[PDB]
Design an enzyme around this catalytic site. Structure first.
Site, PDB file in Angstrom:
ATOM      1  N   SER A   1      18.020  27.297 -10.226  1.00  0.00           N
ATOM      2  CA  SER A   1      16.698  27.259  -9.589  1.00  0.00           C
ATOM      3  C   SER A   1      15.698  26.678 -10.596  1.00  0.00           C
ATOM      4  O   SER A   1      15.539  27.704 -11.345  1.00  0.00           O
ATOM      5  N   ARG A   2      15.353  25.571 -10.801  1.00  0.00           N
ATOM      6  CA  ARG A   2      14.642  25.151 -12.057  1.00  0.00           C
ATOM      7  C   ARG A   2      13.451  25.320 -12.054  1.00  0.00           C
ATOM      8  O   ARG A   2      12.671  25.852 -13.048  1.00  0.00           O
ATOM      9  N   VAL A   3      12.806  25.703 -10.674  1.00  0.00           N
ATOM     10  CA  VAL A   3      11.401  26.480 -10.387  1.00  0.00           C
ATOM     11  C   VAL A   3      11.552  27.730 -10.337  1.00  0.00           C
ATOM     12  O   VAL A   3      10.516  28.699 -10.425  1.00  0.00           O
ATOM     13  N   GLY A   4      12.712  28.223 -10.762  1.00  0.00           N
ATOM     14  CA  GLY A   4      12.800  29.688 -11.159  1.00  0.00           C
ATOM     15  C   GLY A   4      12.390  30.579 -10.216  1.00  0.00           C
ATOM     16  O   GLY A   4      12.281  30.429  -9.047  1.00  0.00           O
TER      17      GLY A   4
END
Lengths: 470, 53, 204, 102, 469
Positions: C170-173
């Site tokens: 999840s790049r948007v963490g």
């Protein structure tokens, strides 16, 4: 007014063919405006096909177009606005502010296309940028005027790496910078807008030490292509006419390739390898060559590149790989190992590293690090099956250092308080060389591996050794 | 007596290993060659289809 | 829930399942079944998106599942080649990235002046052979904000639901993670990562 | 002969701006190689100055040997080294030792 | 006034007509050019304008001299259906090839038909007991479901189906359709013979089976609408007879394949690999005409000749979507001598769920799947090293799994000749018992040959005595 008036004949995607009247040849690479109830649709003239019938690529969405719509000609390549008036205010591809921080504040315009600076213009850099990011500082130092290249995979926080660069380097350097985003999400956009407002780099009142050009991938492929040209021309105004040494940032440049590939098909060209445009080389070449340090300004580009499925053998990354100056490879695996920065240390290479350029000590130290790591990787297979036991005492010391060095590279970042939640640490280059030197000398080979993990300098490593001890 | 049998066993085992691994080299080699050819052909077909249009 | 390319019978079972679980009340099912025309299939996600935008516009918070987006790509391929447009990589048209991107990017968390309206999106891609270099999967991977890889081997392995957590990102963490759940699962990420490394070594 | 110490672009325009080229012909660039009979077998070495090249992989004269390798591994450096060792021979007066590198 | 035309072109079996008379027959209309062989039935597929259609040709296309009269028979070819079409074998044009005199017809229905609506669908959940152990454990059939085979090159694909006919179609006792697209003549002759022999066709009696047979000799275009014809016969049963049926299709790969051939000729830029752009739509139409409405519950068995066992090729891929349950059969598993050759790690059913088939069954099946996956995982280690270099705990698992694999081989009665072993039909309750025991290793201590090619646990136990001697 402009006698150049065209009637649309065929709207078939981005290709919109126009039938300009007799004697009206809107030159290749000009910009046509079609007044629409949506605003003015911009079409970049890309071919003459005969008898005042051009074939143009759209730069704004197509819909509602009625065959016959009157088409005015701007008369030349899209004319952007340039100035220090462009500082602040996010500027979309055509030029209009999309953050709507008042109207176009600029007093000057320039065309999007330009002829690359000549061989004579080129001025060979040698100044060495200091990033404070330790892996970069020791093992692949960046150079001020460089063409840094962030080859990496998606979702490694490709943006996050860049954000750190802006966070350290951009504010630190006095000169203007231009943040250009080619085809990126409005989620990412809002974060970037907010973030650089937060770092204050974007100063809502008072001049911003940056200009912004957010081009997003919700725009047609054609529009995505000429985001790059737009950003470049703004940089050129700074570089040339204001003489400022800037540090360009573009994101993600695979989108630039990709965008060109898409409109290639529409342009009717025979699709090349992995569907890429046949003009891939020259188009990349024009962009990359335009970006350079001249006897005028010095531009320090940082270009993100997305390597599809982490295969650098993919021709599009490979073409860019040639055109850049200071490559950095970001290993997804190493990110997963929990090492942030996630750099692939062996594969990251910068021509900048030389015993003359950064001095003999730096070179020798870095050679020792590289050798230690290369040995570790070579031995990794042996340890995997055979098991570390019959690997020498010497090998054990080298391995022990390598696991430690591997985690000594690790070092938290302030913009990954969002992620890791650990306040950033950035250590001076000279200090980093010294600190890594210490590791190699093995004065800290009594220190636990986890006391190197995710901390700054040698002093910090020692402190964390004491901390873990307690 | 045991130790000699142990080291001897290790020699025997590692020898038999080399043989087993060799066979696997051969099986994947045929797969590699076939796969390599197939990729060239399939990509070429796409290029041709594009040119044909 | 947006259903593209799926048989009327499968969809019909699904709606029954939702009604059994008493949730069809808050559900809208937008469908373009396998029978339904290829143009209608192509048009189907984009018109589902509009249905979503009514929530988003209203300030209401909602979630749109686009299952499976891969069959939309097949449909657009059919259209393009019978619109005699030049064929792209894998014969999908050479503007598929733009099509898929515009569809996906309409989901957003608006500002408070817009009443914090949000359509949330979950695209779903059936991976053919797990080929992440396949054109339709590659394109989508770039577009999306995270990837939640599911692995077949682990399905058989009996992790059901199966989750290829190694490739899930999840790049948007984490910030949509519940504060409590963030605290408890703090080293869960580290532990699992260590488990993966260790498990590999353990075979030999 | 005047192209010694001249950086010229493809058209022959000096991009180092070292002015008009003292070039005694314009000769076609689509001409065929010297025939079987117009060849003499190789008999002159070239010293690259790189030890491995000089021993392990000998380099003659009027012959074509490839330099095939991985991307931007400073391939050009290996080549450039040859030019440098040829400086020693170049300084000399023998016209078989004057290799005019391009 | 039959609409006349001339044959402008004869490019393969995609003849083109130019109607001289104003107003051409519409798309999906049917045309007869009265050939000196009889008739040729053509079907309008494109209008190319200037009153020039482009037509699919359903019979042979040689001896055509350009310019030939056409007559418009209008609309889709309307086949003849009836409760007296039971036990007939009908050609593509519906003519009874079995030639038990002229077809008995009442209602003739168009080959093309629209697929019944979303609201017309009825969603089942019924179990169908197969009696094939591997099927029962891994992917229990659902009555009225759509079952699918993804076998290799006739890898006993037909044999597998024959077993299903042998068990399920005498068990079912409803109306049943066998439609064999691109069936080889010997297989067709055998089936026809078998049906007559087993009285399922009693030729003076009545048949609860009806038959459509399309040879793989038939021109590609003809083969395409063999399928559509069969779907019509099925609809008559589904609707008008209003009875739950069976349907067998062998092979729908031949349907896809046929389409790919005609596609090029039609003038379509052929989609990747080579499949027609309309592959999805055509497959879609076919598979949504095959469905369980509230008018009838159509149990379907569909066979896919996976081309070179590439499931990644687009035609199998698009098939997987349209099947309720699948039982992919693998060439390797056939080589291991396991008949059924069904791959056990590549089988799935929507019916297999804990609630649906009981928690205990699901638990047993889960453990089998997990065990076999372990065995697959340790295939690497097994080869690279030996077996003794496996961990002891694992070695027990491996030995168990070797037993499980061997246990899965169950002789088939239709294959009883071929195997040379009398067939085995094993009850679902019995199957569950057998696996339950094996997982608990109760009877595990006996040869892997004991498990090989025999029926249930009781049979395994008995064969242990045979081997022990």
């Amino acid at each position: 007014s402009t006698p150049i008036t065209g009637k649309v004949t065929a709207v078939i995607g981005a290709i919109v063919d126009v039938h300009f009247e007799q004697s009206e040849l809107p030159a290749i690479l000009n910009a046509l405006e079609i007044k629409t109830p949506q605003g003015k649709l911009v079409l970049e003239v890309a071919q003459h096909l005969g008898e005042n019938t051009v074939r143009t690529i759209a730069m704004d969405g197509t819909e509602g177009l009625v065959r016959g719509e009157k088409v005015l000609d701007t008369g030349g390549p899209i004319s952007v606005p340039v100035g220090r008036e462009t500082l602040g205010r996010i500027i979309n591809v055509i030029g209009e502010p999309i953050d709507e921080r008042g109207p176009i504040k600029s007093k000057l315009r320039k065309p999007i296309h330009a002829d690359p600076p000549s061989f004579a213009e080129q001025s060979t850099s040698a100044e060495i940028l200091e990033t404070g990011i330790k892996v970069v500082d020791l093992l692949a130092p960046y150079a001020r005027g460089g063409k840094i290249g962030l080859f990496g995979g998606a979702g490694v926080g490709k943006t996050v790496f860049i954000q750190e660069l802006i966070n350290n380097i951009a504010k630190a350097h006095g000169g203007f910078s231009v943040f250009t985003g080619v085809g990126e999400r409005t989620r990412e956009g809002n974060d970037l807008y907010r973030e650089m407002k937060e770092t204050g780099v974007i100063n809502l009142e008072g001049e911003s030490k940056v200009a912004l050009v957010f081009g997003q991938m919700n725009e047609p492929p054609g529009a995505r292509a000429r985001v790059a040209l737009t950003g470049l021309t703004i940089a050129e105004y700074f570089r040339d006419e204001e003489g400022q040494d800037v540090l360009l940032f573009i994101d993600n440049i695979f989108r630039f390739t990709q965008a060109g590939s898409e409109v290639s098909a529409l342009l009717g060209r025979i699709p090349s390898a992995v569907g890429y445009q046949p003009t891939l080389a020259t188009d990349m070449g024009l962009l990359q060559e335009r970006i350079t340090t001249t006897k005028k300004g010095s531009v320090t580009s940082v270009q993100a590149v997305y390597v599809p499925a982490d295969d650098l053998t993919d021709p599009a990354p490979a073409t860019t790989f040639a055109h850049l100056d200071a490559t950095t490879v970001l290993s997804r695996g190493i990110s997963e190992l929990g090492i942030y920065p996630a750099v692939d240390p062996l594969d990251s290479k910068s021509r900048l590293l030389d015993a003359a350029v950064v001095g003999q000590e730096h070179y020798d130290v870095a050679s020792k690090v590289q050798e230690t790591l290369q040995t570790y990787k070579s031995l990794q297979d042996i340890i995997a099956i055979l098991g570390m036991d019959e690997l020498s005492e010497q090998d054990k010391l080298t391995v022990e250092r390598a696991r430690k060095i591997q985690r000594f590279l690790s070092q938290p970042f302030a913009v990954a308080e969002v992620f890791t939640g650990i306040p950033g640490k950035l250590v001076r280059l000279k200090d980093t060389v010294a600190s890594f030197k210490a590791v190699l000398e093995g004065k800290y080979d009594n220190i636990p591996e986890h006391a190197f993990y995710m901390v700054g300098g040698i002093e910090d490593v020692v402190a964390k050794a004491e901390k873990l001890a307690a | 007596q045991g130790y000699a049998a142990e080291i001897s066993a290790r020699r025997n085992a590692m020898d038999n290993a080399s043989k087993n691994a060799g066979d696997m080299i051969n099986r994947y080699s045929i797969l590699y060659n076939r796969t390599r050819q197939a990729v060239i052909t399939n990509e070429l077909v796409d290029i041709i289809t594009g040119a044909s249009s | 829930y947006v259903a593209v390319g799926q048989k009327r019978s499968t969809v019909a079972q699904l709606v029954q399942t939702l009604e059994q679980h008493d949730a069809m009340k808050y559900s809208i099912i937008v469908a373009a079944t396998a029978s339904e025309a290829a143009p209608l299939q192509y048009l189907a996600p984009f018109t589902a998106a509009s249905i979503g935008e009514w929530f988003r516009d209203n300030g209401k918070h909602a979630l749109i599942v686009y299952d499976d987006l891969s069959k939309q790509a097949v449909a657009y391929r059919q259209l393009s080649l019978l619109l005699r447009r030049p064929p792209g990589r894998e014969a999908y048209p050479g503007d598929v990235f733009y099509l898929h991107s515009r569809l996906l990017e309409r989901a957003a968390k608006l500002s408070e002046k817009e009443g914090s309206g949000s359509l949330t999106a979950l695209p779903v891609i059936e991976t053919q052979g797990g080929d992440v270099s396949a054109y339709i999967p590659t394109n989508v991977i770039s577009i999306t904000d995270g990837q939640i890889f599911l692995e077949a081997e682990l399905f058989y392995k009996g992790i059901r639901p199966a989750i290829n957590v190694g490739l899930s990102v999840s790049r948007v963490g984490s910030a949509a993670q519940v504060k409590a759940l963030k605290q408890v699962a703090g080293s869960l990420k580290l532990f699992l990562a260590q488990y993966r490394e260790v498990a590999a070594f353990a075979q030999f | 002969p005047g192209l010694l110490g001249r950086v010229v672009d493809a058209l022959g325009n000096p991009i180092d701006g070292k002015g008009p080229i003292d070039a005694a012909g314009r000769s076609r660039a689509q001409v065929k190689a010297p025939g079987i009979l117009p060849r003499r077998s190789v008999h002159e070495p070239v010293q690259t100055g790189l030890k491995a090249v000089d021993a392990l992989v000998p380099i003659g004269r009027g012959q074509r040997e490839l330099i095939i390798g991985d991307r931007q591994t400073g391939k050009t450096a290996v080549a450039l080294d040859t030019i440098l060792n040829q400086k020693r021979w170049n300084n000399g007066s023998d016209e078989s030792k004057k290799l005019y590198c391009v």
